[PDB]
């Protein structure tokens, strides 16, 4: 995704 931590 565009950023980390999204799952």
């Amino acid at each position: 995704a565009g950023h980390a931590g999204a799952g």
Partner: antibody, heavy 116, light 114 residues
Framework: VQLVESGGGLVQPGGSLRLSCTAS????????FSWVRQAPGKGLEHIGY???????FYASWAKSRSTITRNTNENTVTLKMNSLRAEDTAVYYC???????????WGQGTLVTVSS | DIQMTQSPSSLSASVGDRVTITCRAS????????VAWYQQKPGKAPKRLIY???SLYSGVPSRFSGSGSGTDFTLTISSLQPEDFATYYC?????????????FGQGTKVEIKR
């Protein structure tokens, strides 16, 4: 598209700061938002990041005192930091940092002075 | 935990010179791409110039450019102008699917020789 910041100002040591940023022209739930601070004449320091999915991750130095939340109903994101010391005096910003994406939004910043 | 080291911490250059600022990451950034460059002028808020290592924001003059790979990144001002006096920061994004962090470099003050 705007991000208006509110709160802060003069806070006493050992007290707490509460800062909010109200989105206008979009919904807070659609982007991840960081909180960053900058002491007078120093560099930028990252506090914590609230992903678009609602998960909060904090830098180590800030983990024990910081809480970052968001209210989808009021369309706002909020930082709370307690046990404040003079070392916490800084300009605080809410910001989608846009490290790898074309979208980047910053609040105007607000100086928080920790003093009695 | 995560660190980014800029160099130099300050520099002095003349109008028209080419300025290079490097930023060194302690780990790999997210997707080897989430690195942005910011510019802060006196009394102003930081303004983003570059994102995704090398993408120029539409509001920024084209004499700014980004480059780099792996954990070493570079911001380049091709022809230095007086209004380019500022402190420049790299910012990196890090973590995994269950971790998300940002880290700023300590900043590079660019002074104008005159």
């Amino acid at each position: 598209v705007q991000l208006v910041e509110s709160g802060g100002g003069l806070v006493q040591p050992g007290g707490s700061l509460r800062l909010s940023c109200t989105a206008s022209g979009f919904s807070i739930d659609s982007y991840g938002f960081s909180w960053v601070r900058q002491a007078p004449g120093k560099g930028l320091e990252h506090i914590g990041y609230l992903t678009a999915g609602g998960r909060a991750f904090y830098a180590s130095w800030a983990k024990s005192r910081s809480t970052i939340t968001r209210n989808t109903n009021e369309n706002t994101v909020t930082l709370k930091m307690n046990s404040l010391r003079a070392e916490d005096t800084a300009v605080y910003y809410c910001a989608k940092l846009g490290s790898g994406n074309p979208v980047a939004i910053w609040g105007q910043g607000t100086l928080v002075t920790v003093s009695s | 935990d995560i660190q980014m080291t800029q160099s130099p911490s300050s520099l002095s250059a003349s109008v028209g010179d080419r300025v290079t600022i490097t930023c060194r990451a302690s780990q790999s950034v997210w997707r080897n791409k989430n690195v942005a460059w910011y510019q802060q002028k006196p009394g102003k808020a930081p303004k983003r110039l570059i994102y995704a290592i090398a993408s120029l924001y539409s509001g920024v003059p084209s004499r700014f450019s980004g480059s780099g790979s792996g954990t070493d990144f570079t911001l380049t001002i091709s022809s230095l102008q007086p209004e380019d006096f500022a402190t420049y920061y790299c910012v990196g994004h890090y973590g995994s699917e269950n971790d998300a962090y940002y880290a700023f470099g300590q900043g590079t003050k660019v002074e104008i020789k005159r």
